[PDB]
Design a protein around this ligand. Sequence first.
Ligand code: MG
Ligand code: MG
Ligand code: MG
Ligand code: MG
Ligand code: MG
Ligand code: MG
Ligand code: MG
Lengths: 441, 262, 58, 131, 70, 185
Amino acid sequence: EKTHINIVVIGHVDSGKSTTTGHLIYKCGGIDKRTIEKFEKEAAEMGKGSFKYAWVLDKLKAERERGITIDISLWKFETSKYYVTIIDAPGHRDFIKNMITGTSQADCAVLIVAAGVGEFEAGISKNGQTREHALLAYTLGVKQLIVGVNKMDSTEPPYSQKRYEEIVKEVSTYIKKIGYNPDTVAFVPISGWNGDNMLEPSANMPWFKGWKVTRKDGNASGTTLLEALDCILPPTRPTDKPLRLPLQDVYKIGGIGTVPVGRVETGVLKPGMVVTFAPVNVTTEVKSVEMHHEALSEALPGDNVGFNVKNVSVKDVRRGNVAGDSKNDPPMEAAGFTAQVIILNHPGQISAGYAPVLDCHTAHIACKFAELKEKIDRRSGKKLEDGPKFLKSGDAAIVDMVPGKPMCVESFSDYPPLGRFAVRDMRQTVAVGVIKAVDKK
Amino acid sequence: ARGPKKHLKRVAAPKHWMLDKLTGVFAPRPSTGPHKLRECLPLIIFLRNRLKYALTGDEVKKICMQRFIKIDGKVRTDITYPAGFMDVISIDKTGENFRLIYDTKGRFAVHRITPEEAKYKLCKVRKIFVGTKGIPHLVTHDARTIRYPDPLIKVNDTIQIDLETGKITDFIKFDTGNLCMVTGGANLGRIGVITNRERHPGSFDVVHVKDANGNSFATRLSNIFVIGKGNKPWISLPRGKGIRLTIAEERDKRLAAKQSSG
Amino acid sequence: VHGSLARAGKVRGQTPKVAKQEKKKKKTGRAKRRMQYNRRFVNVVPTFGKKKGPNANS
Amino acid sequence: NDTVTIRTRKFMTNRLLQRKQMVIDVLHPGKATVPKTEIREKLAKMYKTTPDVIFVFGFRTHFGGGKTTGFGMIYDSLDYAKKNEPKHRLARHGLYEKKKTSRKQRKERKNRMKKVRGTAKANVGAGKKPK
Amino acid sequence: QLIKNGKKITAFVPNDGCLNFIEENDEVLVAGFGRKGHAVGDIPGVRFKVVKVANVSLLALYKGKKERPR
Amino acid sequence: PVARSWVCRKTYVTPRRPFEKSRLDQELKLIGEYGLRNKREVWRVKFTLAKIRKAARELLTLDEKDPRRLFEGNALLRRLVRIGVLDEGKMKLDYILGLKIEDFLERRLQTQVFKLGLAKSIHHARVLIRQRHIRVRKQVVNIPSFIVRLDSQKHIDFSLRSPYGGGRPGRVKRKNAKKGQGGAG
RNA sequence: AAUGAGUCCACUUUAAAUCCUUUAACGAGGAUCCAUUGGAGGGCAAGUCUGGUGCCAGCAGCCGCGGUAAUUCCAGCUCCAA
RNA sequence: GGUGACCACGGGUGACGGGGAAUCAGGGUUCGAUUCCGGAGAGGGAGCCUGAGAAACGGCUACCACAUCCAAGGAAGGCAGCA
RNA sequence: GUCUCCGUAGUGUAGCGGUUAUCACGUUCGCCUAACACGCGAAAGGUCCUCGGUUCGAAACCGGGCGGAAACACCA
Ligand SMILES: [Mg+2]
Ligand SMILES: [Mg+2]
Ligand SMILES: [Mg+2]
Ligand SMILES: [Mg+2]
Ligand SMILES: [Mg+2]
Ligand SMILES: [Mg+2]
Ligand SMILES: [Mg+2]
């Protein structure tokens, strides 16, 4: 056998992002009816009864009282074919840094847009966040995803054809523009708040006859979300590649001490060898490893686990640090690195000395562009000219930068899950690219 | 403690057991029995360290449970049974008998005896009282009590208890001029003749004893076991005849032995 | 504060950096004791100097 | 094999455990410590017995090679050897099997069985589910 | 200011350029300055000296054997 | 609790005052003459002689004919003549005070093999002993500070496995031989 | 010529291992397979060497050194102690 | 009535007592939480059942202080044992 | 992780969408002494924490990130 797959959820504010996944987790059997009714009664007093299914993922009290997701959160459930976990996204312009962590620790994704009028238009727009989310998924390494349109119950007429088509074609041509394949991605109509079309075909809407998806591995046909996600592509596992592990968070659990939590990218982690954390350069034996409060003998790649380490404190190791085996090549602090970047949109010109924030896997560090080497054509990596003096949108170039704060990075030619990065500024993804050459301290 | 102790630390064990330090943390801790634990020799160390018949407590337990160890004519399966002073140890499978007697250095020696001598045993009477229906009684230095003794027997005399019957065959009165043995204190294991007895009412009586060589010492009355009529012992004395010789004449004995053996 | 801390490390900053000469390893232990015993107990000098010390700056 | 010699000392026999025990020293002037297997049949030839009742252990080699000293134990009969001899030496000779679980797991099973009272099928099923 | 009991003391920084290794809010280790609560030398009223800063020895930083925790 | 022993004692005492020319020069002279590694293993023999002298002085303070004095005096004199630092006929407690640490240092195995001529120098003797070439009776000794008794004096000899008694030459000798046969046919 | 510190087969050890002791086969010429920690005015063993600094930086347990020719700071070289 | 300058009584202790440890001319001065003996305690007090032996706490009861689960009706705690 | 505030020479801060300055100072240089002491006059010292956007132009108007000062949660 059974393979573990990480699914993330991306969408908008009040887009049913947590509501539909609460319905999904209840219907697949992650929680029970008594707990969900307790959520209902807790929502009853302060009137946010629409989000009684959203509170399954919104564990934070501030999240509940504000009605929006602040930080990513995890759940487990077992489908009819394999074992998967799910991460929510905040779905907010401000918490992009929170959601990109979850989308980085992802093997696959689902994208949610509300079908009602007045929300889809703002959802896909220049200020819209669906564009940014779908872009950053491919940028960080979400190879395949699925899309589920939500809240067509609020449409007039509810559950309609033309409303579905006018938006699936728009998102299909957008993902064709960005790189994704509309043929590969499955399109699922779901009524979140009513809880429809997850396990069985809802007979209130018969106009949808089910999607057919084609892919290089094979072909599938789906009618429900479960049928969609039970035929996803199983990702490859770089087990032979040495251990690398970005740390999503660090906890101080009573009775066992400091437990970092992160998703195993490369290599196999098992209790019984020393590891090194790169940015802080500390060496430590691992004591135990554990996924979802269940012990594991090995931590295969693609496993989001919390692992217990000894004789260190919580302050020594923080978010964004990458760990690796000391017996193999140890990850360690990089003074600089060369990246092939693709600038997306910037109101002004980009020159040397520009210091945006580069978001790579879990780390979010401001990096200052040391200098520019050359400009690159959009395709074929074509040499254009040497020594650029300014940069504009829709252009590619080789730029060498040094992070102001200590940061560990890996070249895409070596560690593909660590070579992906994004650049964020003014609440839009200014640049995207990969890392080619890295020096070591 | 909230009750009786049932452990014995290795270093707190009696010195005459000759137990080392590095083999363990604990000592045999002899069970309750006829003799106090300070002056008893448990069978585990008797058969493991004095005779080397066993290498481990498990092996001496196997030997004991196979019912070969007969003490005072009775089979004892206790691994930590307190043997004590001049109890006959009998092994019929290997066909020898042992009498547990202190040496000149105040330690229990491996003393081998003939079966006909082993058939009897000396005891020191510790109290004589009359019980109900006017029945005289006699409690020896063991826990052994007997009824209807000879009325001539008084306190701290010696009696000859033949085994398999437990009755009295003969006795030695505690009298000046009788062969004794010191069963406690510094002079533990010294054979000599009772020469004098000074008695202090309300306190301990001190008896002065001169050995064969003329070295006169003294000891408390409770530490004396009369073992012979005048000067001939009623038992077989160990090597050295209980004559404590000082280190000055022990060293040259060692040198003469080395010279003879080399 | 009076403002006089700015001169911290001044001389250790201005000191020119001259490298250590790469030289032969020194014998250690019994060999070292043998060598320094041989230097100062078995040797004859015909020169005057009133028993000048071992680190004489001649 | 060409120059290997067994010598016995402190030899004694006890019928209490029905055996003859001694301390032996073997001289291997230029070779490693002689294998316990080799001592077994060499001492068996020495005492005209078979190399399956022979029991040796505790072989420590003196500094500088040459002599090594161990403790030799020979029985009159293999049934007695099976009866009064440690299970680890029996397993060393292959006559005893220690195919069993860990002490930790055994304690876990005991503590879980403490939680189930009386009921035979549940008390035996206590360790069935949490393997 | 000492972590225990919150008492405020003055501690010497004993080498040529070891003050630049000290910044604000550092956690320093201070030992006695030589003669049991009595001032030493021409330094008035100072009875303690810094041995370590931020869990790295001042001697190590002065000799360059290891670096400040960046 | 534990069944350890932790019965240990130091074997040496540091001098009272450091940096004094006379003591430094005399200790260095002994080190150079006897091939010692450091000042610690001459302070050790000084401590042993100090303990012996203190015991002898304590015994001398006791009355003559006192059996403890007699017994321990004869025992100490017997040990001293066994290690050979004292003459067999000099069986007096007075002569113990006349002993010097040179007498004890002369009885080391390192000096004994050099005096017997098994080595070309005292340092050659020390390294020869450390490399397991010298044996006493039958046991090989690799301890330079092995005090040699008078009876063991005559039995000092080369080790049988060493490339000086029996055969089995050294690793460099065998490498040179295989180089010779590989270079010259 | 001789050896280990290491690699490493086997025996041995041991409840089972480990380590030590044995013993194969590799294993040293900057034998780079590299000894450090503190000092060189006095107490107190060791430099009136050379270059910087110039009452500054700093050293100095104590006397004291440093304000342009520092036996005491910062360094190089060389010596001293363990 | 009893005890007190032959120091009662009170207070302090960074006091568990001892065997012992460091230092070492002699005499001493410090240290002994720490593997042996004896005592005390099991978060703080207190009260008990059983049993030969406990005012037991890897026994119970109650209060106080912390603190776990809970469907809020209840229920369950004691690492100065080994980790 | 979220939120609140602060960040201009080296400290103390004036400051304007069209000018960053001075002051107690801090430093240096002349200024008298062998060394001082006191005392006189000049100079340097700014990417306005950093990066960008709006604008014809920003330190200041805004979006970030950084550090500091406060608070709230965060238990594989
Ligand atoms: Mg110098
Ligand atoms: Mg106390
Ligand atoms: Mg104590
Ligand atoms: Mg105790
Ligand atoms: Mg109690
Ligand atoms: Mg009872
Ligand atoms: Mg209680």
